[PDB]
Structures are given as structure tokens and as C-alpha cells.
Amino acid sequence: LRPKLSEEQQRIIAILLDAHHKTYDPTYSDFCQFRPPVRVNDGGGSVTLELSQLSMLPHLADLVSYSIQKVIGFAKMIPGFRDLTSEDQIVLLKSSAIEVIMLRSNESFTMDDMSWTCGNQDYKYRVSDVTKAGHSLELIEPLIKFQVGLKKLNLHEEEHVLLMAICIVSPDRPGVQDAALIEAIQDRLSNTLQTYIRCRHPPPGSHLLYAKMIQKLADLRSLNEEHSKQYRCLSFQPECSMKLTPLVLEVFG
Numbered sequence: 001l002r003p004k005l006s007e008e009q010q011r012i013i014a015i016l017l018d019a020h021h022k023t024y025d026p027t028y029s030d031f032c033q034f035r036p037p038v039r040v041n042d043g044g045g046s047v048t049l050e051l052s053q054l055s056m057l058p059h060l061a062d063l064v065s066y067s068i069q070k071v072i073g074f075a076k077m078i079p080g081f082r083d084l085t086s087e088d089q090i091v092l093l094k095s096s097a098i099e100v101i102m103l104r105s106n107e108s109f110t111m112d113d114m115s116w117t118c119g120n121q122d123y124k125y126r127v128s129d130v131t132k133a134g135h136s137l138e139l140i141e142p143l144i145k146f147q148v149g150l151k152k153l154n155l156h157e158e159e160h161v162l163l164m165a166i167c168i169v170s171p172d173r174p175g176v177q178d179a180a181l182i183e184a185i186q187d188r189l190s191n192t193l194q195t196y197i198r199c200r201h202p203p204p205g206s207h208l209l210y211a212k213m214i215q216k217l218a219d220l221r222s223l224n225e226e227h228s229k230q231y232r233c234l235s236f237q238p239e240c241s242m243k244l245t246p247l248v249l250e251v252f253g
């Protein structure tokens, strides 16, 4: 059976599409306002050098901070999000923030050269730029693998925004008070996505896609954990906090 999207489901999708268009600039016209990217000579990928300089940390910290502000705006527009207590809202935003950033970044990721291209050469981020920000291959390599796998699913924008919404409203986040409400909200998003795929998504791969999408959410949890480990070590570097921003410090600190 392939039931049609209900009126409510169509409206949910329309709201999510609109929320993403208001919170995701595909021209990347605000990036010049961030602290400029600085790329030093580190051909050897020296952990010591990278840690002593962190030349890309200020720029990427601003990009991530800017993105967190956009994700918050996006979340507030998710049907049902505002019915939760602010306490539960904060908990969900903090624990999913980096996952949504990795998800939403897929839009700027290109398989031409395995990089995130955001306009001109100055705003093209490769593996080497991330190591210059203080992170190691243990997080970077799986991150790239994740980006390629997500790209290959060739998701419609409707499925892309539904996945980010589902990612944010997870009942199994450490610290949630009303897990039942959150689960109710997530199920409504999940059924919408499942219905949309069977309904609007053409073959090959008509089915299976949902499972593949749910699996990516699991993958994210792992990246979340690894990023968290590396951020901690990174905060051990003296004078590091000044290279970040208050928002990043509170969300990952």
C-alpha cells in the first residue's frame, strides 16, 4: 500500500522547506564577515605545529557558531518543537548541534574534489584545513566518508530537511525530561518521511532509502562522540578559548 500524504503531512513538509530556505543561504554571502581563513605551511600535518598555530580555528569557529545560530532558528520552526519545555529544547539543540551542522553541510559538499565549496577559493574547505583547525584524521576521514555516502543517496530537499528535523528531535538524548512528547513529535516527522518516500520517491531504490537514512543518523552519533573527544583535547591548548566564540564554548564546553 502507498497511502497519500495527508493534508497535515504536506503542511509539515512545506513548513520545513520554508524554514531551511530562511536559515540556509546557498550563496554563502555572509562568510566574508567571519574572521579570515589563514592557511600556513603544514605539508607534514604536524600535530605540534597545528596545535601551536591553529590558523584555521578562528575562521571555522565563526562558521560553526554562525551555523549553530541558524540551526536554532531552524529548530524553532519544527512543528511541535515549541511545545516542549525550554529546558528540553536547549538539551536537544546542544546535543544535536554538531550533527545538524555535518548534515546541512552536505549541501556545500562536492564529490568533484571531496571538499566543501562555499563560493570562491577562500571558502573551499579540504581535509587539510580541518587539521589546521586542531582536529585529527580520526574524525576527518569518517566525516568525509559520511559526506560521500549521504551525497550518493541523492535525497530530495524534502527528505533532507526532514532528516535534520528528525535528528534534532531525538527522545534518546542524555538529559531529556519529557521523552514521550519528543518521541511523539519525532514519530510524526518519521511517518511523514516514510510516507513521502513511498509516495514521491521514484526507483531505483524506492524502498530501502528510509533504512539507509536512519542508518546515517546512527553514523552521526559516532561522529558526535569523536568530535567531543577532540574538542576536549583542543580546549587544553592555552589561549584556545579566545579563538572560539561564547556560543561554541557553551554548546561544546
Ligand SMILES: C=C1/C(=C\C=C2/CCC[C@]3(C)[C@@H]([C@H](C)/C=C/C=C/C(O)(CC)CC)CC[C@@H]23)C[C@@H](O)C[C@@H]1O
Residues within 6 Å of the ligand: 057, 060, 061, 062, 063, 064, 067, 101, 102, 104, 105, 106, 107, 108, 109, 116, 118, 125, 130, 133, 135, 139, 143, 231, 244, 248, 252
Ligand atoms: C558549517 C557549514 C559548512 C561546512 C562544514 C564543514 C567544512 C569545514 C569543517 C567542518 C566545520 C567539520 C569539522 C570537523 C568541525 C569543526 C569544528 C570545530 C570546532 O571543534 C568547534 C565545534 C572548533 C572551532 C564539520 C562540518 C565541516 C558550510 C555550509 O554548508 C553551511 C554549514 O552549516
